[PDB]
Nucleic acid binder design. Sequence first.
RNA 1: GAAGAUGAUUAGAGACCAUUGUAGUCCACACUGCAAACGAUGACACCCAUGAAUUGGGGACUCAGCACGUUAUCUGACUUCUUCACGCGAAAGCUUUGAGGUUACAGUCUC
RNA 2: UGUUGCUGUUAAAGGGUUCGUAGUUGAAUUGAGGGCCUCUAAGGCGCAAUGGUUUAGUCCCAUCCACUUCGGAUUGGUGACCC
Lengths: 223, 129, 83, 207, 141, 104, 44
Amino acid sequence: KEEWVPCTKLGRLVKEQKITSLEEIFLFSMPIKEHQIVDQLIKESDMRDELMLIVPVQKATSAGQRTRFKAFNIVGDGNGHIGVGARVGKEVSLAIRASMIAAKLNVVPIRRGYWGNKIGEPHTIPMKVTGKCGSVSVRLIPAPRGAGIVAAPVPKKILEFAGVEDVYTSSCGNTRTRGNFIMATFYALRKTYGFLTPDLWAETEVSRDPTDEHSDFLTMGSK
Amino acid sequence: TMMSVLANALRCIASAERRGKRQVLIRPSSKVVVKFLQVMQKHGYIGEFEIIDDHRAGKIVVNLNGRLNKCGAICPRFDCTTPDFEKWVKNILPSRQFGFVVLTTSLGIMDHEEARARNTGGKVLGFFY
Amino acid sequence: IGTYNEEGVNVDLYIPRKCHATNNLITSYDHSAVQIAIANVDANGVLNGTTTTFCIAGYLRRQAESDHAINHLAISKGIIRIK
Amino acid sequence: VESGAKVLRMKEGDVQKLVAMHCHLGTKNRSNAMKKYIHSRTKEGTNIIDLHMTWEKLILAARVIAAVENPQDVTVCSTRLFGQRAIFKFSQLVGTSFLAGRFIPGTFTNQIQKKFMQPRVLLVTDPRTDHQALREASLVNIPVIAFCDTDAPLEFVDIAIPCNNRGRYSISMMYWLLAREVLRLRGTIPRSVPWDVKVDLFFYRDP
Amino acid sequence: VRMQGVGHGKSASSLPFCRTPPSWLKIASRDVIDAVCKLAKKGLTPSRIGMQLRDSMGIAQVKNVTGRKILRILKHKGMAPEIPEDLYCLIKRATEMRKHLERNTKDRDTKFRLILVESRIHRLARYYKRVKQLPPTWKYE
Amino acid sequence: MTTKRRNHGRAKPPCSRGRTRPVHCFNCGRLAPKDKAVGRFVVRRMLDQASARDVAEASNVYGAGFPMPKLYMKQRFCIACAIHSRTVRARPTDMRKRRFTTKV
Amino acid sequence: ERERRMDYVPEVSHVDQAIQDGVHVDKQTFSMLKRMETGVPRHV
RNA sequence: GAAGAUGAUUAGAGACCAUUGUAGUCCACACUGCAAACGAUGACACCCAUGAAUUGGGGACUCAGCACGUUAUCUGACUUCUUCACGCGAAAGCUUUGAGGUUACAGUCUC
RNA sequence: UGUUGCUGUUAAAGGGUUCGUAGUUGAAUUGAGGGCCUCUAAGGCGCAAUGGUUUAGUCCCAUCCACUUCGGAUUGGUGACCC
């Protein structure tokens, strides 16, 4: 792109070789405020960007009416990183460009476990999870190997992104409003790490934030 | 009134756990409620518990380490069997890996895992994650 | 620690942090889950350097249970004195 | 702390100051979450704060600001005149950043703004009306330390120092004690001497 | 919950946590027994026997200072009533309501109360003929 | 349908009474429950200030001699009644929830 | 800004601490002090 | 005061309004059981946080070893936070006083 | 049509209330035992011994006296406690 100037601590570190992966940023909870943080760390040839929806919205005005376009982006790596944008712009290309920014901010990692057969690398979600936006709520159920992605084409996409290849699913409520279904499905795949399991606990040690360690070089950064 | 002793106990535990509280009080006591707690304390989900004596009915008190996520009760005590371990373990639990259903048998009170091992089914009791 | 294979090899992207107070997994999603680092002190008022660490969850600032738990954590490690 | 020689412990003259300038008291109203801090109630109806409790809170917050090796990342904030002065004198010594007068929204979250900053830590004079600050500390992963009136809520306050924020002489004392002890642990001013400059410098005066 | 109609109360009497007799009670089983039976000959119900005893003699419980409680005493000496306390009381109250209603047929309250008291007595009756303590041909009227 | 008002425009709480006596209006004669009805207390003068002077001149035992009495009344109005003389008015959401108790 | 000169030799600091200037305070405050490890300071 | 009568109002008007007036409005004894009979929230039971009040009881000469008030505590009722915590709900809203503890779906009964 | 797995404040849907039989559902107690030997198997908020000049401490004491926020002093001291 055009030449870039970080206004973020993280941004500086990422432009240097200090933070070299998403993991570091995630592990000590910090918000991503610049999409350029994603592009630098995760190289292109792993990232994919699809537009799940583009639709007109209308706002009422006396006589003629102004119009706009909502759209969704979806983004991520098949290595277990996903992130869903949605944004609004008064023209087509506007809302498109805007979506992809927001999407790369909202990126979250994915835990994949097993069904109770352990071979290779994860093919299955570690547990049942649910996510809800509007009246729709999705129930992701873990499936045995070779099941394939058993869901509708709308979530099939969203699951392919997140590296889940074996699942069984069902939805509830009004599912024929597209937008609500997307957000729902995504909140599901978050909830994995949000749930405490015996395998994880051992009172795993914490250490200093990248920010703190690199404080000196951020001071120098400011200059 | 209460028509299941277990239901009265394990809705105090679940609520308390969702608020992160590190001890809970339990109004009644039974021989049954003891055994249920015992299981989970072995597998590491409870620190300790005390039974206190009022010489009418006891008041259990438990120390939560926050390692639980739910403790349920299967109220009608439906019949589960050697094939039908599979059925329950899928349907009410989020996993087959760390889901624990607890059952009653003539032998005693035990996990499904140990039930299969000794090859006796029975009537279900409760469950936890 | 973490998910393994039958070959014993870790499959996880990361192993999330512990909130010492509730022993619950701190998510990446929670940005109210702050890591408080206090610097220890010895005789003659010399800092040992930052050594100890606390981690608080983002579910403890939605009703401000934070302060309460920090005290029980601290007092146990002899950092805060009680009479 | 330990091992240690009873270091950074309350003393004769320390107490003598606090009592005098009336920061040992709280606000009159009963607490909404700070009930534990209160020690009894007077026959004036004003809730006294326990001294030992307050003292340990202060030492704690010293350990926090001691653990930032680039003090400018910590912020101080007042929205009250009585703390205004004491901020400026503190930001000289300890070297902290500050904003005083009034908090401006989006100084910790809004990218397009030249008053934008990312703190490591945040302080406040009153969590009640500095509240905007706290709610933008929440979403940036910034811990908080506040000077809590007994009445005041503790929402989005990680660590809390019980305090009286009524009148000049109350607030000045607290900043003075922090600043003192902080500089005793960093740059090693000894506790052998009484500290170099006075609390009268931290009193609001009007220009 | 109150059996019939609204009510939640917690007014109750507890127990001692010491089931062995006090040091200031040096009285033997026999003295206690004698006192009970003596009082009973006035026509007092067990409820007022216990009250007289506890207040005057400092008795913690009858059950604590004798091996048995008040009815068991009476039964064994053949002074026990053949109509249980709880039943008798209700029947008295009942009849008195029926007096008032005989005069006042405009009274709404005491009518509804009598309906309650009736069915309550019936519940008692039914109980005590399962658990034999009345004849199996007993009926309120 | 929608619960516009929690107390339903009443000073009557749920699950207590369910019946409070009707009361006439001093405007149109409309009846409404006492709790619904809109109370005010008037304190109406028996003389204007302008006329008070003129009468207190001719008085010797009154006016200066004793302070003038006032006609006191309670006024219970209907809803429609109140609104039309604009002594109660529509308010925004935040304000509708406010009360001033029984004090003026 | 520099019209503010607050430099005075003790002044309000040690006066408030009482050279013999006195401090008097509630009896609840007294009770608290004497049960502290420090105990009461002079002039209170 | 329905019905009825008369006068207006109106293009038309027992209309809404005004003056009247029967049944009815009241009581006793019989029927009727038809309401937005609403909290549009079935009954019993458990768990569940913030603040300030009110209503009863309890606790620390002459209807009179009394009555009221204040501080603090408790049990039982009605409700407010117009700073009600978690959570739930499509939203409005609901919050120990649930529509909360429910896709992690099972306390009990009934319509 | 929701037993597994439905909904009923406002969307179709809690009966005006209470009593009450069939029917459905119903609290706690009887109690599931022990010892000696090996095993560095663990923990120890038990403990005789004996170790440790600040090669680690705090109370007491010494010297100052500092009106009040200095200290150090050695064998200190079966003291306290630590490997």
